[PDB]
């Protein structure tokens, strides 16, 4: 199914219109919207505890737990209506402590010998993320200077919500993926500019 087509938005306005139309169709509850807004204000407040507890909600402080329950509930309403590509920018920390401080050369270029170790470790393997995954419909300026760009191939019907309208931030075309999402890193490449790693991820539906 990952060999099928995936819509990749490049036009900020077509993207914003499509997403705005999707968001209206979800009919989220006031409580779901509130929880999503809280998530956008400080995602790490929720993702951090999720990661520490490997998705075990019993280990979250009560307020965080309740917020996670509402966001999870919000996903019963949010699915993508078509195969789509979602983009995400990440810092080296995404690759783990073994690579966090070694993947970039002092000038910001990708350390090639280290990249080879990164590929070995991750390429062709599944990765499970315990926090929610924030993405964008567009590979925009919001990702300026991020050394890692992931392009997720998300299949029609997969839980995913265009949440940009209720975000505390602007012009980001934000799409959220459920917590405990699994994806296959199908490829990893160094960008032509030599300052970014591009990850091709196949999101498990």
GROMACS .gro file of C-alpha atoms in nm, residues 10-204:
model
  195
   10UNK     CA    1   0.346   2.222  -0.152
   11UNK     CA    2   0.098   2.509  -0.187
   12UNK     CA    3   0.038   2.668   0.155
   13UNK     CA    4  -0.309   2.795   0.061
   14UNK     CA    5  -0.449   2.476  -0.097
   15UNK     CA    6  -0.316   2.294   0.210
   16UNK     CA    7  -0.468   2.538   0.457
   17UNK     CA    8  -0.807   2.522   0.279
   18UNK     CA    9  -0.812   2.140   0.271
   19UNK     CA   10  -0.717   2.115   0.639
   20UNK     CA   11  -0.964   2.382   0.749
   21UNK     CA   12  -1.236   2.184   0.572
   22UNK     CA   13  -1.128   1.859   0.739
   23UNK     CA   14  -1.120   2.019   1.086
   24UNK     CA   15  -1.478   2.140   1.048
   25UNK     CA   16  -1.592   1.785   0.960
   26UNK     CA   17  -1.447   1.626   1.276
   27UNK     CA   18  -1.709   1.791   1.500
   28UNK     CA   19  -1.475   1.770   1.801
   29UNK     CA   20  -1.619   1.823   2.149
   30UNK     CA   21  -1.536   2.131   2.351
   31UNK     CA   22  -1.334   1.906   2.582
   32UNK     CA   23  -1.137   1.750   2.294
   33UNK     CA   24  -1.062   2.090   2.147
   34UNK     CA   25  -0.946   2.219   2.490
   35UNK     CA   26  -0.716   1.921   2.534
   36UNK     CA   27  -0.568   1.966   2.184
   37UNK     CA   28  -0.510   2.335   2.253
   38UNK     CA   29  -0.330   2.246   2.576
   39UNK     CA   30  -0.118   1.997   2.385
   40UNK     CA   31  -0.013   2.262   2.132
   41UNK     CA   32   0.078   2.515   2.403
   42UNK     CA   33   0.341   2.276   2.547
   43UNK     CA   34   0.357   1.936   2.379
   44UNK     CA   35   0.658   1.824   2.587
   45UNK     CA   36   0.447   1.848   2.903
   46UNK     CA   37   0.241   1.562   2.768
   47UNK     CA   38   0.485   1.371   2.547
   48UNK     CA   39   0.758   1.361   2.809
   49UNK     CA   40   0.549   1.175   3.067
   50UNK     CA   41   0.405   0.952   2.789
   51UNK     CA   42   0.756   0.853   2.688
   52UNK     CA   43   0.862   0.788   3.049
   53UNK     CA   44   0.567   0.557   3.099
   54UNK     CA   45   0.586   0.382   2.760
   55UNK     CA   46   0.222   0.479   2.701
   56UNK     CA   47   0.105   0.344   3.039
   57UNK     CA   48  -0.157   0.599   3.139
   58UNK     CA   49  -0.153   0.483   3.505
   59UNK     CA   50   0.190   0.643   3.541
   60UNK     CA   51   0.082   0.988   3.426
   61UNK     CA   52  -0.011   1.259   3.679
   62UNK     CA   53  -0.391   1.285   3.675
   63UNK     CA   54  -0.418   1.610   3.483
   64UNK     CA   55  -0.194   1.480   3.201
   65UNK     CA   56  -0.379   1.152   3.199
   66UNK     CA   57  -0.715   1.325   3.148
   67UNK     CA   58  -0.568   1.536   2.867
   68UNK     CA   59  -0.436   1.224   2.696
   69UNK     CA   60  -0.774   1.054   2.730
   70UNK     CA   61  -0.944   1.351   2.551
   71UNK     CA   62  -0.685   1.368   2.274
   72UNK     CA   63  -0.716   0.993   2.229
   73UNK     CA   64  -1.095   1.045   2.214
   74UNK     CA   65  -1.047   1.318   1.957
   75UNK     CA   66  -0.878   1.060   1.727
   76UNK     CA   67  -1.198   0.852   1.712
   77UNK     CA   68  -1.313   1.147   1.495
   78UNK     CA   69  -0.996   1.229   1.304
   79UNK     CA   70  -0.872   1.026   1.012
   80UNK     CA   71  -0.705   1.120   0.689
   81UNK     CA   72  -0.952   1.078   0.393
   82UNK     CA   73  -0.669   1.000   0.148
   83UNK     CA   74  -0.308   0.875   0.129
   84UNK     CA   75  -0.102   1.178   0.228
   85UNK     CA   76   0.254   1.278   0.311
   86UNK     CA   77   0.311   1.459   0.647
   87UNK     CA   78   0.637   1.634   0.734
   88UNK     CA   79   0.813   1.672   1.068
   89UNK     CA   80   1.130   1.848   1.171
   90UNK     CA   81   1.347   1.708   1.448
   91UNK     CA   82   1.669   1.785   1.640
   92UNK     CA   83   1.955   1.530   1.675
   93UNK     CA   84   1.807   1.411   2.006
   94UNK     CA   85   1.556   1.225   1.789
   95UNK     CA   86   1.836   0.981   1.696
   96UNK     CA   87   1.919   0.900   2.057
   97UNK     CA   88   2.206   0.988   2.293
   98UNK     CA   89   2.461   0.782   2.097
   99UNK     CA   90   2.415   1.022   1.805
  100UNK     CA   91   2.277   1.348   1.954
  101UNK     CA   92   2.613   1.523   1.980
  102UNK     CA   93   2.802   1.342   1.702
  103UNK     CA   94   2.579   1.357   1.391
  104UNK     CA   95   2.656   1.722   1.306
  105UNK     CA   96   2.997   1.859   1.219
  106UNK     CA   97   3.093   2.183   1.401
  107UNK     CA   98   2.981   2.384   1.098
  108UNK     CA   99   2.640   2.216   1.093
  109UNK     CA  100   2.700   1.974   0.806
  110UNK     CA  101   2.606   1.604   0.854
  111UNK     CA  102   2.898   1.396   0.977
  112UNK     CA  103   2.899   1.133   0.701
  113UNK     CA  104   3.078   0.856   0.888
  114UNK     CA  105   2.833   0.901   1.175
  115UNK     CA  106   2.537   0.905   0.935
  116UNK     CA  107   2.643   0.560   0.816
  117UNK     CA  108   2.608   0.435   1.173
  118UNK     CA  109   2.268   0.605   1.200
  119UNK     CA  110   2.143   0.425   0.889
  120UNK     CA  111   2.268   0.094   1.013
  121UNK     CA  112   2.085   0.142   1.336
  122UNK     CA  113   1.752   0.266   1.198
  123UNK     CA  114   1.710   0.197   0.828
  124UNK     CA  115   1.453  -0.073   0.755
  125UNK     CA  116   1.351  -0.101   1.116
  126UNK     CA  117   1.026  -0.012   1.294
  127UNK     CA  118   1.018   0.268   1.545
  128UNK     CA  119   0.739   0.317   1.801
  129UNK     CA  120   0.683   0.667   1.947
  130UNK     CA  121   0.503   0.689   2.280
  131UNK     CA  122   0.425   1.060   2.262
  132UNK     CA  123   0.192   1.212   2.001
  133UNK     CA  124   0.362   1.307   1.674
  134UNK     CA  125   0.318   1.666   1.551
  135UNK     CA  126   0.363   1.710   1.179
  136UNK     CA  127   0.290   1.962   0.907
  137UNK     CA  128   0.106   1.926   0.572
  138UNK     CA  129   0.389   2.126   0.419
  139UNK     CA  130   0.769   2.116   0.438
  140UNK     CA  131   0.758   2.482   0.544
  141UNK     CA  132   0.970   2.753   0.702
  142UNK     CA  133   0.858   2.618   1.037
  143UNK     CA  134   1.132   2.358   0.980
  144UNK     CA  135   1.405   2.610   0.900
  145UNK     CA  136   1.738   2.497   1.043
  146UNK     CA  137   1.606   2.159   1.163
  147UNK     CA  138   1.872   1.900   1.086
  148UNK     CA  139   1.627   1.612   1.044
  149UNK     CA  140   1.317   1.603   0.825
  150UNK     CA  141   1.085   1.303   0.828
  151UNK     CA  142   0.832   1.250   0.548
  152UNK     CA  143   0.563   1.010   0.671
  153UNK     CA  144   0.358   0.821   0.416
  154UNK     CA  145   0.014   0.799   0.585
  155UNK     CA  146  -0.253   0.578   0.434
  156UNK     CA  147  -0.614   0.670   0.380
  157UNK     CA  148  -0.814   0.587   0.691
  158UNK     CA  149  -0.531   0.625   0.938
  159UNK     CA  150  -0.592   0.828   1.251
  160UNK     CA  151  -0.455   1.180   1.186
  161UNK     CA  152  -0.605   1.521   1.256
  162UNK     CA  153  -0.553   1.863   1.102
  163UNK     CA  154  -0.552   2.060   1.428
  164UNK     CA  155  -0.403   2.389   1.309
  165UNK     CA  156  -0.724   2.590   1.377
  166UNK     CA  157  -0.724   2.526   1.755
  167UNK     CA  158  -0.350   2.563   1.793
  168UNK     CA  159  -0.191   2.834   2.009
  169UNK     CA  160   0.049   2.887   1.718
  170UNK     CA  161  -0.004   3.024   1.366
  171UNK     CA  162   0.079   2.935   1.005
  172UNK     CA  163   0.208   2.585   1.076
  173UNK     CA  164  -0.044   2.361   0.897
  174UNK     CA  165  -0.027   2.131   1.197
  175UNK     CA  166  -0.145   1.772   1.167
  176UNK     CA  167  -0.132   1.545   1.472
  177UNK     CA  168  -0.069   1.172   1.481
  178UNK     CA  169  -0.185   0.942   1.766
  179UNK     CA  170   0.046   0.843   2.049
  180UNK     CA  171   0.210   0.499   2.033
  181UNK     CA  172   0.231   0.526   1.653
  182UNK     CA  173   0.460   0.279   1.472
  183UNK     CA  174   0.641   0.346   1.152
  184UNK     CA  175   0.900   0.176   0.932
  185UNK     CA  176   1.199   0.390   0.844
  186UNK     CA  177   1.212   0.285   0.480
  187UNK     CA  178   1.500   0.520   0.392
  188UNK     CA  179   1.744   0.776   0.532
  189UNK     CA  180   1.941   1.015   0.314
  190UNK     CA  181   2.160   1.321   0.344
  191UNK     CA  182   1.999   1.623   0.168
  192UNK     CA  183   2.188   1.790  -0.124
  193UNK     CA  184   2.261   2.091   0.099
  194UNK     CA  185   2.453   1.852   0.328
  195UNK     CA  186   2.291   1.997   0.639
  196UNK     CA  187   1.984   1.776   0.672
  197UNK     CA  188   1.893   1.412   0.702
  198UNK     CA  189   1.570   1.313   0.523
  199UNK     CA  190   1.385   1.018   0.669
  200UNK     CA  191   1.120   0.825   0.480
  201UNK     CA  192   0.877   0.676   0.725
  202UNK     CA  193   0.592   0.436   0.652
  203UNK     CA  194   0.324   0.490   0.912
  204UNK     CA  195   0.156   0.166   1.027
   0.00000   0.00000   0.00000
